[PDB]
Amino acid sequence: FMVSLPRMVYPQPKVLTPCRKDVLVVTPWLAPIVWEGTFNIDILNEQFRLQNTTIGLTVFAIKKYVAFLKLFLETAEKHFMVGHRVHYYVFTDQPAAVPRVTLGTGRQLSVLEVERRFLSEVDYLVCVDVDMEFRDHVGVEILTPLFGTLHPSFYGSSREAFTYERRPQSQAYIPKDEGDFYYMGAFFGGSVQEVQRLTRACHQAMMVDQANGIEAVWHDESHLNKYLLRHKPTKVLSPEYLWDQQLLGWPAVLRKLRFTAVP
Numbered sequence: 001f002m003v004s005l006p007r008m009v010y011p012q013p014k015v016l017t018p019c020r021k022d023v024l025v026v027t028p029w030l031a032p033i034v035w036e037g038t039f040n041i042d043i044l045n046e047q048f049r050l051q052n053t054t055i056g057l058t059v060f061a062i063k064k065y066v067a068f069l070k071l072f073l074e075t076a077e078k079h080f081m082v083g084h085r086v087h088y089y090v091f092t093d094q095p096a097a098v099p100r101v102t103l104g105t106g107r108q109l110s111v112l113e114v115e116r117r118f119l120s121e122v123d124y125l126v127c128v129d130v131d132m133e134f135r136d137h138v139g140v141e142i143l144t145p146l147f148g149t150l151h152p153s154f155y156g157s158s159r160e161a162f163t164y165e166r167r168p169q170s171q172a173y174i175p176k177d178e179g180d181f182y183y184m185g186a187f188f189g190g191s192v193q194e195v196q197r198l199t200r201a202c203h204q205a206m207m208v209d210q211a212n213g214i215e216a217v218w219h220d221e222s223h224l225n226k227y228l229l230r231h232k233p234t235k236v237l238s239p240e241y242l243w244d245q246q247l248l249g250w251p252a253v254l255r256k257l258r259f260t261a262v263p
């Protein structure tokens with residue numbers, strides 16, 4: 001059950017005036033592709049806050065990567081789901097090495113040394129790499145049952161150029177005449193149920209490959225792409241959400257650089 005939104009004053013959407021004329025804002029299966037200018041964050045914030053939405057952000061920090069946690073968490077505090085309930089889950093082999101980062105109210109961090117917990121603790125799960133930093137708003141506009149993010153190096157490439165696993169012997173195999181987009185494995189998520197379905201599917205597919213003596217060209221990412229090809233995401237995030245400015249600069253098509261790689 002969802003309560004009614006309160007009175008709100010904002011610019012009237014214009015039916016005869018497209019959001020963007022330079023990019024695709026909706027997929028062929030009617031899933032929005034999230035770009036700056038396509039959403040009114042005030043309306044979305046209201047919708048998700050009225051549902052007391054809790055977002056879980058999971059990251060794995062092993063070995064040398066624990067060094068990226070401080071910047072990752074500090075910037076997440078400034079740009080990730082601000083105003084909403086957030087629960088960080090840091091999976092690490094060095095619990096004592098996790099930095100003591102100051103969190104805003106309604107935000108929590110759990111250290112898990114290296115389930116049902118997720119189903120009872122959060123509504124959505126967002127899975128990202130730790131060697132990154134938030135530079136701009138990353139909010140509820142990304143929440144949906146299942147989402148993938150366009151890889152910054154292939155958003156303008158033809159499917160033939162996509163680095164999908166091309167060997168039929170692999171469970172992640174995708175032929176040259178198939179494929180919608182090339183999603184990057186560094187940023188995906190959705191409802192806890194959908195994320196667990198995806199991780200379960202990929203885990204089993206990888207085991208099958210292992211038994212067959214084969215390893216997907218881009219490992220987990222190859223399997224992620226096969227899954228999202230067969231189970232269309234309900235939202236697709238634009239490269240604004242996964243960028244590398246030193247490697248790719250700042251093209252006009254990107255009005256904002258929200259989550260980027262750390263040099």
Ligand SMILES: OC[C@H]1O[C@@H](O)[C@H](O)[C@@H](O)[C@H]1O
Pocket residue numbers: 153163184185218221
């Ligand atoms: O072609 C796929 C590869 O693209 C690279 O730019 C990226 O650093 C790799 O992690 C992998 O995603």
Ligand SMILES: [Cl-]
Pocket residue numbers: 058127199
């Ligand atoms: Cl994950």
Ligand SMILES: [Hg+2]
Pocket residue numbers: 018019020037038039
């Ligand atoms: Hg618009």
Ligand SMILES: [Hg+2]
Pocket residue numbers: 058125126127195
């Ligand atoms: Hg995850």
Ligand SMILES: [Hg+2]
Pocket residue numbers: 058059060126127128
């Ligand atoms: Hg993760």
Ligand SMILES: [Hg+2]
Pocket residue numbers: 198201202203205223224226227
């Ligand atoms: Hg998969």
Ligand SMILES: [Hg+2]
Pocket residue numbers: 199202203206220223
């Ligand atoms: Hg996997």
Ligand SMILES: [Hg+2]
Pocket residue numbers: 198199202220221223224227
């Ligand atoms: Hg996967």
